[PDB]
Each structure stands twice: as C-alpha cells, then as structure tokens.
Amino acid sequence: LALSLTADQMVSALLDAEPPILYSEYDPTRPFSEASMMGLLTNLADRELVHMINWAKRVPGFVDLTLHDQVHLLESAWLEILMIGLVWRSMEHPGKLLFAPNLLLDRNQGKSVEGMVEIFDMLLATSSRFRMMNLQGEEFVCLKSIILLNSGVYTFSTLKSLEEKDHIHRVLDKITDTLIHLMAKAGLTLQQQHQRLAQLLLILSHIRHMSNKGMEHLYSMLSDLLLEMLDAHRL
Amino acid sequence: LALSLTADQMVSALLDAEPPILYSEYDPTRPFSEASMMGLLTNLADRELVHMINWAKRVPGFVDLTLHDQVHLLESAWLEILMIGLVWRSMEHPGKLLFAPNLLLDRNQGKSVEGMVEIFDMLLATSSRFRMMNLQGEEFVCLKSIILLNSGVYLEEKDHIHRVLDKITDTLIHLMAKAGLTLQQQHQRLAQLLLILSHIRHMSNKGMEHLYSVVPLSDLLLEMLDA
Ligand SMILES: O=C(c1ccccc1)N1[C@H](c2ccc(OC[C@@H]3CCN(CCCF)C3)cc2)c2ccc(O)cc2CC12CC2
Ligand SMILES: O=C(c1ccccc1)N1[C@H](c2ccc(OC[C@H]3C=CN(CCCF)C3)cc2)c2ccc(O)cc2CC12CC2
C-alpha cells in the first residue's frame, strides 16, 4: 500500500497527517513565570505526544510494522519530532522559540533554567538554518517522517525483524523519491536537487545531537504509555 | 579554491589522504585483561587523533578555513571519525570490532564494563548496515569528509563549508553514477548514506556520555597542527 503511493499521494498523506498546533494552558491562576515554565512546557509536550501517536499511525507504512517496532521507533524519535516541530514553528520568529502561539520565548527566558540556553541556542540555530534554506512545509513533513522511521532503525535479528527493517528502508526510499520530486517540481536542477537533499538530511544529524543533549537535560530534572496509545482497540 | 576539483580528483585526494591503521600498544606476550582494556583503547585513540589531523589537512577545502574553524571542526567531529573508521575496518568481521589488527574484540569482552556493550552493539549495527549496503571505500572517505565538515557548523566561513559539502555530495552522486546506479538509485543511496550519519552522531553523543562518565582538547589539536 505505502510502497505503491506516488510522490504527490505521499505529500498529500503527510500533509493530511500533520497534527494541530497546540497551545499552552490559559490558567490565570498559573501565570507565566520562571518557576512555572517547565510545568507549562512539560504539559504541552505531553499533549503533543498524544497527537504525535496519531500522526505516526498516518505516516504511510508505519502501521504495517508490529506495534513493538512502532513503540521502539517512537521511543527513539519522539524528542527529535518535538524539536523539529518547534524549529519549524519558530522559523518565522528569529531569535525566539514558538513553543505555542501563546508561548513565544526569547533567549533570556531560557537562562532561568541552568543548562537550558545551550539547547535553546542549538534550536535557534536550526531555525535559522531552515529560514536561510527557505524550508517548505512539504519538505518539513518529509523530514519529520524520515526521523520517525530512521531514528530507531539501527537499534532494534529475527526473520521478522529483517522484514521490518527492509520495509522501513523501502518506505524511507519512497520519502526520498518524494523529497526529490518536490525539488524537481520547484525548478531545482538535478545537481541542486541532490545538494538540497544532502543539506536537509545533514540537518537531521544536528537534530539527533540536540535530542541527545535534550534527553540529558530533561533527565537532569514512556514505553508503556507509547504502547497504550499505539495499542488501540477496534471497538 | 578546492571547489575547482573534479569529482574524480576529489575521490583521488580523499583516498590519498587516508590515515594509516595504527596498532594497539599491547604486549602480544603479556596476558590479556579487561581492566587494561580502556588504557589500550584510550592510548590507541590518542595516537589515531594525530593522524586524523594529517588527514583533515588534506581534505580539500579544510585548510581554507581559519585555524579557529579547523580546530572547532576537529574537536566536534573527532569521535565520529574514530567510530566510522572503526566500523569501516570491522565490516569483514561480523559480530566483532577490529580496533587494531592485534585488537579484535567481540561483544563479550565489552560486557565486562558498565555502559560499553550498548555502544558496542550500536557500532556492530553500523558495521552490519555498511555490510548490507556494500559500502565502497570511495563512499566511505566521502562520508568521513562530510562528518568532519558537518558536525560543527551548527558567516562566510559557513558558506565555504557548505560549498565544499555540496561538492562532496556531487562527488558521491558521481561515484554512484559511475557505478551504474540509476538516478533514482543514486538519490536513494545518498539518502541512506547520510541517514547513517545521524546514527554515528548518536553513537558519538553516547560515547562522550560514556567516555567522560585538564589540558583542553583544542590546545592539543593546535599543537598537533604544528607538525
Ligand atoms: O522545555 C524544553 C527545552 C529544554 C531546553 C532547552 C530548550 C527548550 N522543551 C520542551 C519539552 C519539555 C519536556 C519534555 O518531556 C518531559 C517528559 C517527557 C514526556 N513526559 C513524560 C510523560 C508522558 F507524556 C514528561 C519534552 C519537551 C518542549 C515542549 C514542546 C515542544 O513542541 C518542544 C519542546 C522542546 C524542548 C525539548 C527541548
Ligand atoms: O573503547 C571504545 C568503546 C567501544 C565500544 C563501546 C564503548 C567504548 N572506543 C575507543 C575510544 C576510547 C577512548 C576515546 O577518547 C579518549 C580521550 C581521552 C583523552 N584523549 C584526548 C586527549 C589525548 F589525545 C581522547 C576515544 C575512543 C576507540 C579507539 C580507537 C578507535 O579507532 C575507535 C574507538 C571507538 C570507541 C569510541 C567508541
């Protein structure tokens, strides 16, 4: 099914799978402050993670995998997906991170939490990189889907596992075909298509680097829950 | 000014720049032990770092950067380069890591140490992935050069790095075209190769988190550049 989609049908399915932009809580009895900042950001990420589950299930080829492999892929990629969504939202807001439309934070508000501004600056630089590249929404949904399928594919031996890995790489190839088709459709020459494809995928290495640094920072302050939403019934 | 090379001359320059395969400073006659296994791997990595400097100087476009940028890229990419070099030489040794011709280890020698077997397995999975794609030497040296130039970039200095990165991308595509790959197979394989770099970054982050669980590395890298 997923391997027979055209590039336009793959763009359409990814654009349609896009989750909504969530808001920070409008609690007057909890106004924004340095103390309540991480509580608001954690609550926002928790609500985003629920929508990330539905988005993943709508990425073509994802539900063809076993849920154990669906859980592992999302366990490996969830923070990367949150960050690239943040970086995408903040593209039009230089020097600031748009966590939510009602939660636009500048660099100085990150200094209140120790260790935050280092991750803050890396997210800002990625947003500047996307801005300088004029990243398109059709390219963004492809990059996010690549992260979902690639981040955990090297950390799964059984015959089933060999079929799953081959399928993940077959779907990743079709996203690559989709990215190139979007670049050819935009007028880029073949040399420019390969060059921009390389530039976009090399940004994924930095997003992984930010994720690892973000995991150490967050731990300095999921599997069962990921399963519970992914292991839905048909009632 | 290295942007005036051809794809074939880019390959030839990177192949000629390959560092030698160093040996473990290990007594082939004294008994082996796991307590001395970090000392051998730290000593080997320190000696490989010097030859990594010589290799980086010969990556086309690297010396065009300032010494500040050359050191910053080396300080940010050195662990990734050691890892992918290890993965490259451990390819024909499935289930094993060939740190040196006299230092071949399997999983069980890594289990003796807290936190090693996790990175050991990720390194083995990368070697298996290289073995499945049948990675060529001309592709491997292009991947190492991309790691050197990409691992620290995130104004005209960044522009020059991106132009050289763009040329290595053109070199990789030219390599697969000369191999007979179709245009679809070319950009598919290029994507597969560059997506492996995200896993190598992941291993480097966990490696730093592992290895580092007085003299700054930049001072040592600067001194190595004087030879
Ligand atoms: O604050 C920060 C931040 C930190 C340092 C520098 C700059 C920014 N973050 C935010 C964040 C907080 C907690 C979290 O994870 C917390 C547990 C993990 C699941 N939770 C467990 C319970 C299961 F739901 C709790 C994930 C994300 C957040 C929110 C929304 C967004 O779009 C993006 C981000 C990005 C960022 C990830 C870097
Ligand atoms: O053992 C391990 C290993 C393998 C599996 C699981 C866990 C660990 N490693 C080895 C390694 C040891 C110490 C290093 O960092 C030492 C710094 C301490 C002062 N140094 C800086 C100042 C003086 F230079 C550097 C780096 C590399 C090593 C050696 C050669 C190779 O090709 C590759 C590797 C790979 C590697 C990185 C994963």
PDB file of C-alpha atoms in Angstrom, chain A residues 129 146 150 154 169 173 176-177 180 190-191 194-195 197-199 201-202 204-206 208-209 212 216, chain B residues 125 129 146 150 154 162 166 169-170 173 183-184 187-188 191-192 194-199 201-202 205:
ATOM      1  CA  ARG A 129      19.196  27.165   9.052  1.00  0.00           C
ATOM      2  CA  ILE A 146      12.192  10.306   7.939  1.00  0.00           C
ATOM      3  CA  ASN A 150      15.221   6.280  10.701  1.00  0.00           C
ATOM      4  CA  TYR A 154      19.732   0.852  13.743  1.00  0.00           C
ATOM      5  CA  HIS A 169      14.103   1.295   4.372  1.00  0.00           C
ATOM      6  CA  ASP A 173      13.434   5.396  -0.069  1.00  0.00           C
ATOM      7  CA  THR A 176      13.492  10.269  -0.612  1.00  0.00           C
ATOM      8  CA  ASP A 177      11.819   9.944  -4.016  1.00  0.00           C
ATOM      9  CA  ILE A 180      13.443  14.858  -4.858  1.00  0.00           C
ATOM     10  CA  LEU A 190      19.416  17.804 -10.732  1.00  0.00           C
ATOM     11  CA  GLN A 191      22.632  18.989  -9.080  1.00  0.00           C
ATOM     12  CA  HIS A 194      20.919  16.238  -4.722  1.00  0.00           C
ATOM     13  CA  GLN A 195      22.642  19.130  -2.953  1.00  0.00           C
ATOM     14  CA  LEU A 197      18.570  16.681  -0.301  1.00  0.00           C
ATOM     15  CA  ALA A 198      22.014  16.307   1.272  1.00  0.00           C
ATOM     16  CA  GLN A 199      21.746  19.612   3.146  1.00  0.00           C
ATOM     17  CA  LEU A 201      19.407  15.228   5.718  1.00  0.00           C
ATOM     18  CA  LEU A 202      22.606  16.536   7.315  1.00  0.00           C
ATOM     19  CA  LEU A 204      18.911  15.582  10.862  1.00  0.00           C
ATOM     20  CA  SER A 205      22.308  14.783  12.390  1.00  0.00           C
ATOM     21  CA  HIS A 206      22.145  18.050  14.341  1.00  0.00           C
ATOM     22  CA  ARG A 208      19.708  13.982  16.745  1.00  0.00           C
ATOM     23  CA  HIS A 209      22.549  15.774  18.537  1.00  0.00           C
ATOM     24  CA  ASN A 212      20.632  13.521  22.940  1.00  0.00           C
ATOM     25  CA  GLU A 216      20.367  14.519  29.295  1.00  0.00           C
TER      26      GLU A 216
ATOM     27  CA  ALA B 125      24.823  -2.478  13.915  1.00  0.00           C
ATOM     28  CA  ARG B 129      24.436  -1.724   7.899  1.00  0.00           C
ATOM     29  CA  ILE B 146      31.156  15.107   5.402  1.00  0.00           C
ATOM     30  CA  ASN B 150      29.163  18.985   9.112  1.00  0.00           C
ATOM     31  CA  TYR B 154      25.521  24.492  13.823  1.00  0.00           C
ATOM     32  CA  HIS B 162      28.553  24.344   2.682  1.00  0.00           C
ATOM     33  CA  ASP B 166      27.936  20.479  -1.751  1.00  0.00           C
ATOM     34  CA  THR B 169      27.629  15.497  -2.421  1.00  0.00           C
ATOM     35  CA  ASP B 170      28.336  15.942  -6.138  1.00  0.00           C
ATOM     36  CA  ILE B 173      26.455  11.152  -6.736  1.00  0.00           C
ATOM     37  CA  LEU B 183      19.090   8.383 -10.988  1.00  0.00           C
ATOM     38  CA  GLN B 184      16.504   7.030  -8.547  1.00  0.00           C
ATOM     39  CA  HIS B 187      19.466   9.783  -4.577  1.00  0.00           C
ATOM     40  CA  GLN B 188      18.065   6.798  -2.669  1.00  0.00           C
ATOM     41  CA  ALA B 191      19.917   9.444   1.452  1.00  0.00           C
ATOM     42  CA  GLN B 192      20.660   6.048   3.008  1.00  0.00           C
ATOM     43  CA  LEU B 194      23.594  10.434   5.017  1.00  0.00           C
ATOM     44  CA  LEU B 195      20.954   8.950   7.328  1.00  0.00           C
ATOM     45  CA  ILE B 196      23.649   6.646   8.731  1.00  0.00           C
ATOM     46  CA  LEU B 197      25.491   9.797   9.824  1.00  0.00           C
ATOM     47  CA  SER B 198      22.658  10.562  12.252  1.00  0.00           C
ATOM     48  CA  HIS B 199      23.285   7.212  13.943  1.00  0.00           C
ATOM     49  CA  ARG B 201      26.290  11.240  15.770  1.00  0.00           C
ATOM     50  CA  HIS B 202      24.068   9.325  18.204  1.00  0.00           C
ATOM     51  CA  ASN B 205      26.954  11.541  21.937  1.00  0.00           C
TER      52      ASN B 205
END
